[PDB]
Amino acid sequence: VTIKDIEVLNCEYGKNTIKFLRLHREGKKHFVKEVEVCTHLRLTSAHEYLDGNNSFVIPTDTIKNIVLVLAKKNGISSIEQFAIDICKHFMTTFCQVAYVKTYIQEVPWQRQYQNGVPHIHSFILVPDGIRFCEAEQCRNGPLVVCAGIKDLKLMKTTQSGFEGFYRNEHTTLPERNDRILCGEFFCKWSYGECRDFDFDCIWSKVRECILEAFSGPPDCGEYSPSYQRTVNCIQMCVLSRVPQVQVIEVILNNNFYNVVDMKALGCTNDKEVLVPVETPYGSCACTLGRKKYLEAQS
């Protein structure tokens, strides 16, 4: 074996979990954006791996310094714009960069309120689904922006079943038309190259679509015949209501809530006491894209 028999399929490096708070003051009123940033590069050469020559390597320490400098100089209007600014900086500054990817997630600080009055400078951590984004670009290619929400845990106590599935000698699952639907969601969507809109406004709108499609209307809900169908309802709601979304990926990790058999304990459990099964757990995942966007890619 020698270097000549071996092909480099991929080389990538970067700085992970760069944590900082960007503070902005309008007189007495304070605004915060706390983020965690990961920035990864692929270089046009691999001399650092193949030859022990570091000449082209931008230290990961420099990646961190650049992220902090851009936050200071530019501020953070949206994590998407900040991710774009970082990718653009790397592409326009370093000719040895073949590819840049920036991942950002928001720390979910909310302003405190007292009797409906917003506090000028006090905040509470409220994780109701983590906001993230991702920007990436190859040399001479498009800068593509994705946004998402993860660690989003939703549960409805009825309007859920799973019936009429494939049966075989190892299938013991009963048909059910009235279970708890409990899901941890990862949702990620692509804007492609479109960046003419309010990133915060569209992110909020997509989140609203996910919750409403999951839940159905507040007065009656909507029957889910499978986790898979609920994923589809979420994706089709987003695509129907948010033209900026070109491609949407949803992953639902479910937890079954078992109605505990209490016969042997001398009472009847009419869907009163339910025990969650956290492992093993089921998952389903789907990615839908607009035909017109995918054809335009070719």
Next chain:
Amino acid sequence: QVTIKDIEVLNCEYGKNTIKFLRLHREGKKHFVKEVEVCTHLRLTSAHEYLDGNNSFVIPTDTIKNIVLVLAKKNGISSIEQFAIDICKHFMTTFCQVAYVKTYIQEVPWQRQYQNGVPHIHSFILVPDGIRFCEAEQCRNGPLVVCAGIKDLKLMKTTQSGFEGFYRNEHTTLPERNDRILCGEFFCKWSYGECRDFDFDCIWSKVRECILEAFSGPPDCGEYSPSYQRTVNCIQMCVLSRVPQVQVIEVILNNNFYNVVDMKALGCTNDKEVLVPVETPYGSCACTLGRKKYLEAQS
């Protein structure tokens, strides 16, 4: 070569940990959930299972789990405090070999979903903005004592915080500061003693409100904190002033310092614009205050 005769049993305790279940209640089409994690521990009047390999008096931890689930079905859960009381009372009445029972309960923070201000009949979202818990305990022929609390409560203010005039010595490099970020993860636990005649949910919400308001100060100007320790005291004194049911209050503040990154070498000036949190190592302070009247009554 040591025998039972050379050795003293100082403590023996056992139990069931992380009993997880959802209690579902339906009022027509409107669904209500209480999902909890329960730990119930017992001390028995004897230690034959340890000393002699004799299990005659041991209540299986499996039976502890069965009892918790049966009581949830039969009684429901009006509040986790009432459920913890019901579990402790059940063990003390039912089993004469129980010397002591302690029940710890924490709520899974499900919130009802709203669409355009309309509450959803049966859909919920997980929102961990401080975990509600309680603890009930009782020794044979002693009082059943109930505590409630909130933990993993993370609060931050961006100003009205300093730490000055502290003790200096040859290993003290900390500068005096009058304008830092105050970021704290709070554990708060309070005792009601034996009083259980009031709305547990209403009082818990009121104590939480006092913690947030005392931490923050008024929304138009805030309030200067001269230390983490003083902020803990302000929280405790606010709760005791506004919530007569609270006899004893413990607060633990785990802080994170946010450093203003020196950017001189990167050719720019950072005027408290970019701050980097230090998560480890981290400072902690803890205080427990009690009402003199309640502590004297204990004697």
Next chain:
Amino acid sequence: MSQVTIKDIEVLNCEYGKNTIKFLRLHREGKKHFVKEVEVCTHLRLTSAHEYLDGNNSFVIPTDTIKNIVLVLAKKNGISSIEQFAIDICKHFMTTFCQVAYVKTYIQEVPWQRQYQNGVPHIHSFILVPDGIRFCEAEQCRNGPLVVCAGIKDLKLMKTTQSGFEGFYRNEHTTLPERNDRILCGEFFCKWSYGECRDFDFDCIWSKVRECILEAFSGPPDCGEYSPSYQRTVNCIQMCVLSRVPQVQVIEVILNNNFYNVVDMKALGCTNDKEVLVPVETPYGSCACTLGRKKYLEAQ
């Protein structure tokens, strides 16, 4: 709170009916034919709303039945005047159906005129002449008065002078010049109440009110009469009707105007001395006034 129920909600109004019931009533006196072609709308409010609130139709009179009743009454009673026919329809509903809380009948005439050859009326031939559509309206609530209104709409009148608009309120957004000699062109909606009085010749009084509107609009035929605004012309019409027609208790007049602009033709190398005028159809001005006799208003 997840949905509203009937308990959180007030029914402010529930009304239904049949609209644009079109028919011709033909009457023959030997060879001589008489026509009355009408368009009828009849609306009911019922004493309950179970059809809306509960999906229960037990008390609902089908709108198809409303149509049948209007056609049957036209056959049985004839149409002496649209007002008497509207009265007959309201009375039928109130006396027949205990579930009717309120009835309103609106009728308009199709404006057929008999053809004339050298002043001789044709026995059976007619021409459509829409020079102001005649209508009426009768309504009654259970245990209340049956009230009759008559009117004329789509009446378009124009005079070429004796019209101005001067001395109006001026402000930074007011560019309108003062004018003392413009075209006054108005499309009129006129509606008047007789209240409960129905002892007179409906056709005769309707014709008299129409005559008053035309004469008050126009002024005397040898000189006319100066109008200082659309609003003043509306008042002159209303005060003429009230002066000459005692049966009219309350009168509503709506004037939708069209301004005729004297085209500036300077750039086209000629002078337009109020010779060529271009109507502005949108946007358009409107004014509306309702006057009532103090005696009638006090009495109710």
Next chain:
Amino acid sequence: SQVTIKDIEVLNCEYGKNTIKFLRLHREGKKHFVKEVEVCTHLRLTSAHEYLDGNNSFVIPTDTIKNIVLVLAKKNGISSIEQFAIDICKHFMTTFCQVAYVKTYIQEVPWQRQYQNGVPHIHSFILVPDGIRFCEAEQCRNGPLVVCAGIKDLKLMKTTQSGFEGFYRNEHTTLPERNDRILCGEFFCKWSYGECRDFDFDCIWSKVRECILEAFSGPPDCGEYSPSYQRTVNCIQMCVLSRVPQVQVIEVILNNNFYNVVDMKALGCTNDKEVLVPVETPYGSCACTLGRKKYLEAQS
């Protein structure tokens, strides 16, 4: 006997400018945005000297109303027709002390941006009337500024899951009971926000439209049985009130068209609900206004 001003009461005086049509164009670089509207603004003045005395001193010309609408569109832009109607009413109330009352009605021209291969066109539009959006704002001196929004000329049809049975029977009722007809309705829907203006007008208008379509239709896989036009109106209103707390009062008018299964027996074939002929006149109407008890009590 000639009547004088002393015998007569002025019950109502109102005037205004109707059908003010314009397009507001906004450019963000190459990308063009349009809002084309039709505005009517009406005033009641604190005096009626223009009618009673031929004195125009207090009259704001309708031409000035038009100028103000155009000036406000230029200065403010149009984020929503509701905000524009608010801006017009506020301008009149705060500018003219002789104004007792202002009402502004606005409807949108339904321009939609063109798309090619999923790509929105920077500056090209097509007219797509799928229900006309309108709003109405009004205010009396020292009274609340009240905003209403609506959709009209909205024509919806389902081909089954509709009947009308169990209705009141009488000697003039020939309508057969039916459990499987076409339900075809032209809807006028208007709702009041009262004084609440803390929400996104465009977002809530779209949400109310969605409620109307979904309540009319039922779920797309099975639909929902309608036992009357009246019950369908109620389902629409109760869906909107359940889902849209901002709606205080909702009025729905359903004008229906019956589709008759043509009897083709004499033409030698059987028509099994294959060929249906719409009856456009006469036509049935039903109308309901529901209000929240809390809002109506707060008014008194």
